Write an enzyme that holds these catalytic residues in place. Structure first.
Site, mmCIF file in Angstrom:
data_model
loop_
_atom_site.group_PDB
_atom_site.id
_atom_site.type_symbol
_atom_site.label_atom_id
_atom_site.label_comp_id
_atom_site.label_asym_id
_atom_site.label_seq_id
_atom_site.Cartn_x
_atom_site.Cartn_y
_atom_site.Cartn_z
ATOM 1 N N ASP A 1 0.816 -1.210 0.000
ATOM 2 C CA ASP A 1 0.000 0.000 0.000
ATOM 3 C C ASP A 1 0.852 1.262 0.000
ATOM 4 O O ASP A 1 1.344 1.689 1.048
ATOM 5 C CB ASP A 1 -0.903 -0.010 1.247
ATOM 6 C CG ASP A 1 -1.837 1.188 1.320
ATOM 7 O OD1 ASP A 1 -1.988 1.883 0.302
ATOM 8 O OD2 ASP A 1 -2.455 1.407 2.397
ATOM 9 N N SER B 1 -0.726 15.555 -12.183
ATOM 10 C CA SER B 1 -0.987 15.179 -13.563
ATOM 11 C C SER B 1 -1.234 16.421 -14.406
ATOM 12 O O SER B 1 -1.751 17.422 -13.923
ATOM 13 C CB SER B 1 -2.212 14.258 -13.626
ATOM 14 O OG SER B 1 -2.613 13.967 -14.951
#
Length: 330
Positions: free
Chosen positions: A35, A199
């Site tokens: 994770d 992004s």
């Protein structure tokens, strides 16, 4: 040193991935959920409340000659999905894919929430976010990666998740045979303890690319792609009959649909998520309504590039003095 381990979907939908991890002496092998969105290595154990264990493999520290109680230390964690666990702490030898760390904090669960109990395939979590998020008190502990880093050939790990197939986690090296083209690297903020990056935009299907900054985290422990409501609405508007259902808890779509791809930007580069990766199947057995793999982050407080996005790429988690993230097509 290096390590290399295969990671395997827990079910036919890629709801999560499990990776075998050796703990203790002699080795006890547990299948852990790696994770990159948290920083605790915790396991089902001989100390876990018996009624809360249902099929998981447990760590028994009394059977490990290298286990030592970390006296006075406790831990307690709550995850984004509302699940939780807590307990006490041992140090022991931990190996992943041939890479060994001695003195690793292994957090032994005394209590786990129902979602963990109900998932027989996940024996615990191995956190790979920054150690500043580790929950051990009163002495915070380091992640497996942080402990290994100085010994690694290069201070990196990579995630290469499969679509409906196994993939690979590598530590200490970049497998240049595992991706196509070049890896594009992008800046990381560690201010919230996550692999947080920005992004450069998105496209839906064959549509034009929209240049827009989207701050989010690379999180292998989250199943879906969670993005701003504007972006998600633009995606689902291209699927006839798709709608957000408050009763189901997100966007659903007719199982008869063909889903468009979704593209996200990494600098000037582009990662394309095929439409099939966005199908999470019937909402209940026999239903013709299917759950979508791209959902709004509006309730969460952060955008999350979870497995739906990451499995479309070869992803480099660069843990150099100034960390960065790399993405390549594959």
């Amino acid at each position: 040193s290096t390590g290399s381990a295969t990671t395997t979907p827990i079910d036919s939908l890629d709801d999560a991935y499990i990776t075998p991890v050796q703990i203790g002496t002699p080795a006890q092998t547990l299948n852990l959920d790696f994770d990159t969105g948290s920083s605790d290595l915790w396991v089902f154990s001989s100390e876990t409340t018996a009624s809360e264990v249902d099929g998981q493999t447990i760590y028994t520290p009394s059977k490990s000659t290298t286990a030592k109680l970390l006296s006075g230390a406790t831990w307690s964690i709550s995850y984004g999905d509302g699940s939780s666990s807590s307990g006490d702490v041992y140090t022991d030898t931990v190996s992943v894919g041939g890479l060994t760390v001695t003195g690793q904090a292994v957090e032994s669960a005394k209590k786990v929430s129902s979602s963990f109990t109900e998932d027989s395939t996940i024996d615990g979590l191995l956190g790979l976010a920054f150690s500043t998020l580790n929950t051990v008190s009163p002495t915070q502990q380091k992640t497996f990666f942080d402990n290994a880093k100085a010994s690694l050939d290069s201070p990196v790990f990579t995630a290469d998740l499969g679509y409906h197939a196994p993939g690979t986690y590598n530590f200490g090296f970049i497998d240049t045979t595992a991706y196509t083209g070049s890896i594009t690297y992008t800046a990381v903020s560690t201010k919230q303890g996550f692999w947080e990056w920005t992004s450069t935009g998105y496209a839906v299907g064959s549509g034009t690319f929209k240049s827009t900054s989207i701050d989010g985290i690379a999180d292998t422990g989250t199943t879906l792609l969670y993005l701003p409501a504007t972006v998600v609405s633009a995606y689902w508007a291209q699927v006839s009959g798709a709608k957000s259902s408050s009763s189901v808890g997100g966007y659903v779509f007719p199982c008869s649909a063909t889903l468009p791809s979704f593209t996200f930007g990494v600098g000037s580069a582009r990662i394309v998520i095929p439409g099939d990766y966005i199908d999470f199947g019937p909402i209940s057995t026999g239903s013709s309504s299917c759950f979508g793999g791209i959902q709004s982050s509006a309730g969460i407080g952060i955008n999350i590039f979870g497995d739906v996005a990451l499995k479309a790429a070869f992803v480099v988690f660069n843990g150099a003095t100034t960390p960065t993230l790399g993405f390549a097509s594959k």
